[PDB]
Design a protein around this ligand. Structure first.
Ligand SMILES: Cc1cc2nc3c(=O)[nH]c(=O)nc-3n(C[C@H](O)[C@H](O)[C@H](O)COP(=O)(O)OP(=O)(O)OC[C@H]3O[C@@H](n4cnc5c(N)ncnc54)[C@H](O)[C@@H]3O)c2cc1C
Ligand SMILES: Cc1cc2nc3c(=O)[nH]c(=O)nc-3n(C[C@H](O)[C@H](O)[C@H](O)COP(=O)(O)OP(=O)(O)OC[C@H]3O[C@@H](n4cnc5c(N)ncnc54)[C@H](O)[C@@H]3O)c2cc1C
Ligand SMILES: NC(=O)c1ccc[n+]([C@@H]2O[C@H](COP(=O)([O-])OP(=O)(O)OC[C@@H]3O[C@@H](n4cnc5c(N)ncnc54)[C@H](OP(=O)(O)O)[C@@H]3O)[C@@H](O)[C@H]2O)c1
Ligand SMILES: NC(=O)c1ccc[n+]([C@@H]2O[C@H](COP(=O)([O-])OP(=O)(O)OC[C@@H]3O[C@@H](n4cnc5c(N)ncnc54)[C@H](OP(=O)(O)O)[C@@H]3O)[C@@H](O)[C@H]2O)c1
Lengths: 486, 486
């Protein structure tokens, strides 16, 4: 065994870098490859991956801006001398956000440089067994070999295929660094990315509209999804139901130009047009598994979804090649899990760890104007598994004390758990719509990993006055009809 | 036979919870709540200590300090909000109060709706099953009940020095001061002392804290010190090992001018200085003395004032029970008072065999940098399982939100305590950071489930949320590895 690297990692994102750092921690000579292919409009960025640059970080930060705005309103009723002269500066904001992104890029680049991990800013490509072609930025190609390979390329934003979409529209990739303020914009899609973005754009004071093909947050508990939508609507975000863009024309040009979106319902022959300054398409992402020469090494992938089938140890059909993160099939497209898989994989390969990555009950939270945290089965899925008559739902509204003197949004925040009667009222589903949803959810996710039961939950004393406490004493069920409108 | 099935003395957190519950079972119940005036005349409405002069007003004002800080942040996120904004003490108070007012009344409607008699009179035992109810204007009345529940809670304790009752204020007076405290001195180092000093400071005032010995006695001292350091780092001045010997009125007025003179606990040193207000946050004394416990023969720890009770909150006298703060060797917290109250009722009038679990009751101090905790402290962990059997995995974290406002890095801290002799059981949870309570709640449930370090690691964290830091704790204090490089 005398290859170039002990392990070559393709992709320097959440998983890639986590894997790289672990392995290195054990001496294994590792090399990471990372290359960012520009968006149809020319956007590109530094080391880090989706989240670090065009995902979570920028997303959460801007969501904080919208939140801070709302705080400026609350400060008044608390005795702070602030007016409504609260006007936003999109550039000044983006300027801060991007600058922070700069730092992360350099931080990440330095963690490796100091961990004895080689970093090459080149596009990887398998050419043959244990062999990979590394095309650099200026076309210069180079060839490396390694005992093992880790595929962690992640995904990129998808398109509609309609006319003008790639020429006049923007994706999550372009959004977080737009040189100009989006202005009145339309958001096509209803995934968390779609809603999160629409929400903070709106929260930042813009005119936002959301075009929905079918339902909201397909995949999550629909009851929650609707409440999230209602809050958004109740606040100004406009929704267009069951429609999809068919064309996009540049009525006028200029930083935020004038776009002429045309679209048509599904169920009907109806067709409508509208105008906007920006059009952000948030209709999902496609794995970057096609153009990497998986053939030259013989790695099977779900030719349809682009996803890579993998053993419960993140191993592909090819024994020396593994896959981690979003590109994986029937797993969970989340940054924290990508890092676990990455780090545990390394531990198993170079430390005799027999620990496997647990993709069950992975907690999650959507950062819409009204944050939604969750962990475990959704309501519909809970019945679809244990039988409608074996699960009881305990729900209740709650009021963030921080909201009483500002005097707003009562009976809006909602919480609910899902228990399986045939198993000691096991808490199999956890949902909360309210401020700091994530902070509230984390701990409970740990509780589920411990088999939290309704009895144990009740026996836990809540903390006063903290939102979360609403979860320690819930007795009104859905199968009792009891009205919880207080 | 008797006038009532159950007469409850004290209409606070426990009292009302007990009343409302017990009533739910067609029991003829009555609540007696009387607020004896403060040394300076301050009084308030139904609800107990938490509603009027406790949690609620405390948390709310703490939110005012927070909102102020947010006004600062907004600027770096693209909000045109001039640095330096004035705060209105009077405005804020008027708002808090109105909220408490709304509450007082609310609870009033709660009891009556559930057919619970409420009498605004001071209760007093006069003989077996007999109680004297002295009303506001001296008119006394006498009632009898099959059972009695003592839930009188406590009240602020004074030093005993000259001028303390005539020129100083307590938590009781603070939340409704008709004038802005101005430069003030806070005597004490309990959570009440620190919380108040903190928000007063956060509201823009000159605050000083006089400490007799250590900070937050009873709490993990490592945490306590970090909390103090943050406070000091922000302007709150501390005077170590000194106790007020006497306070004199240099002047009078709304914001008055008092002189304080205190002496060392170490040496003979004696010191003094001008202060507009002087708050004495040095603990509370149970209201168990002046209620005629003799006439019915209920034994109490004559020294502490607390009331010894069985594991069902039953006193030595079979028809008399006690709940809440006045209890001995338990936890003085609103949420527990309500559990004891609600479960006691369920046991007495619903055949419930469930007992109140005072073990691992989660808690969180609302200092400028919130501190949440649950379980054994570090020092106590060793004092129980032996220093070599406990692991301390810790780490600093920096809330995403402080990245662009670029402030307070390497300040937020988290740590768990595991017992090696028991699968690295998580026996102690601590977190210093924003929204400490929201983060802690869930974990407290996890402990009730026996959370183990292995289970914790197997839990996937939510990104980018503060709480997540706990899902990957790897650096232990013993493996004396610096973590102060974040
Ligand atoms: C708008 C948005 C918001 C999100 N918000 C959250 C959130 O709040 N929380 C959360 O947990 N997750 C969030 N995610 C998802 C998160 O970003 C992904 O789960 C995570 O990045 C996946 O890890 P990965 O390792 O697969 O890397 P990326 O997905 O980090 O993939 C690796 C990188 O390598 C590049 N690459 C691909 N092929 C090659 C090659 N051949 N050579 C070199 N480089 C290559 C990729 O284009 C990319 O830059 C969000 C995603 C988006 C789009
Ligand atoms: C500054 C401060 C901050 C606090 N912050 C928090 C916090 O964040 N979270 C938390 O959980 N707890 C907090 N607490 C404590 C919490 O409020 C108490 O633990 C809780 O109120 C105790 O419950 P209780 O039932 O004993 O009622 P109170 O202690 O609510 O007692 C009930 C009532 O009975 C009255 N009474 C007394 N004697 C008689 C009599 N003879 N006849 C009739 N009525 C009588 C009292 O005056 C009072 O109105 C705080 C306390 C203080 C002082
Ligand atoms: N769907 C699930 O149950 C589920 C659960 C967990 C993980 N996943 C992962 O998510 C993948 C699905 O693709 P994805 O990640 O790119 O997106 P996504 O997160 O599944 O879905 C985003 C949503 O995309 C919209 N959308 C997709 N194509 C569209 C189009 N052509 N026009 C308009 N709207 C469109 C959806 O419309 P609709 O309202 O019509 O859906 C909806 O708004 C799966 O293959 C899997 O890897 C799916
Ligand atoms: N030793 C005890 O205090 C004690 C004994 C038995 C039971 N308990 C339990 O603890 C609960 C809380 O006790 P608590 O209400 O007395 O106060 P506390 O909340 O325990 O403590 C407040 C803190 O009070 C300070 N303090 C107390 N007396 C003071 C004085 N004369 N001058 C200056 N500072 C003073 C303490 O200093 P120091 O840190 O120097 O004390 C410290 O700042 C009780 O209700 C009971 O359940 C406490």
């Amino acid at each position: 065994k005398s290859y170039d690297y002990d392990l070559i990692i393709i992709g320097g994102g959440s998983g890639g870098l986590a894997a790289a750092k672990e392995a290195a921690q054990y001496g294994k000579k590792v090399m990471v490859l990372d290359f960012v292919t520009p968006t149809p409009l020319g956007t590109r960025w530094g080391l880090g991956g989706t989240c670090v640059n065009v995902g979570c970080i920028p997303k959460k930060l801007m969501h904080q801006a919208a939140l801070l705005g709302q705080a400026l309103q609350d400060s008044r009723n608390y005795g702070w001398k602030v007016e409504e002269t609260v006007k936003h500066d999109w550039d000044r904001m983006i300027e801060a956000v991007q600058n922070h992104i700069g730092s992360l890029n350099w931080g990440y680049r330095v963690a490796l440089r100091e961990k004895k991990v080689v970093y090459e800013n080149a596009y990887g490509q398998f050419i043959g067994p244990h062999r990979i072609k590394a095309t650099n930025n200026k076309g210069k190609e180079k060839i490396y070999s390694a005992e093992r390979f880790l595929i962690a390329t992640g995904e990129r934003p998808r398109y509609l295929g309609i006319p003008g979409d790639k020429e006049y529209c923007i994706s999550s990739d372009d959004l977080f660094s737009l040189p100009y303020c989006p202005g009145k914009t339309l958001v096509v899609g209803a995934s968390y990315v779609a809603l999160e973005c629409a929400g903070f754009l709106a929260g930042i004071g813009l005119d936002v509209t959301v075009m929905v093909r079918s339902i909201l947050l397909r995949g999550f508990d629909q009851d929650m999804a609707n409440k999230i939508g209602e809050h958004m609507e109740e606040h100004g975000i406009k929704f267009i139901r069951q429609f999809v863009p068919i064309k996009v024309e540049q009525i006028e040009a200029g930083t935020p130009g004038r776009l002429r979106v045309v679209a048509q319902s599904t169920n009907s022959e109806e067709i409508i047009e509208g105008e906007y300054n920006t059009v952000m398409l948030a209709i999902g992402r496609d794995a970057c598994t096609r153009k990497i020469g998986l053939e030259t090494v013989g790695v099977k992938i779900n030719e349809k979804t682009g996803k890579i089938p993998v053993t419960d140890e993140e191993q592909t059909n090819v024994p020396y090649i593994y896959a981690i993160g979003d590109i994986l099939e029937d797993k969970v497209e989340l940054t924290p899990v990508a890092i676990q898989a990455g780090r545990l994989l390394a531990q198993r390969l170079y430390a005799g760890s027999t620990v496997k990555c647990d993709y069950e009950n992975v907690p999650t939270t959507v950062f819409t104007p009204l944050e939604y945290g969750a962990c475990g089965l959704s309501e519909e899925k809970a019945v679809e598994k244990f039988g409608e008559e074996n699960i009881e739902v305990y729900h209740s509204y709650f009021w963030p004390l921080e909201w009483t003197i500002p005097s707003r949004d009562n009976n809006k925040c909602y919480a609910k758990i899902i228990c399986n009667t045939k198993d000691n009222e096991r808490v199999v589903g956890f949902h909360v719509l309210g401020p700091n949803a994530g902070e509230v959810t984390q701990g409970f996710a740990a509780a589920l990993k411990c088999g939290l039961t309704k009895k144990q939950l009740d026996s836990t004393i809540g903390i006063h006055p903290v939102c979360a406490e609403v979860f320690t004493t819930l007795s009104v069920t859905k199968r009792s009809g009891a009205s919880i409108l207080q």
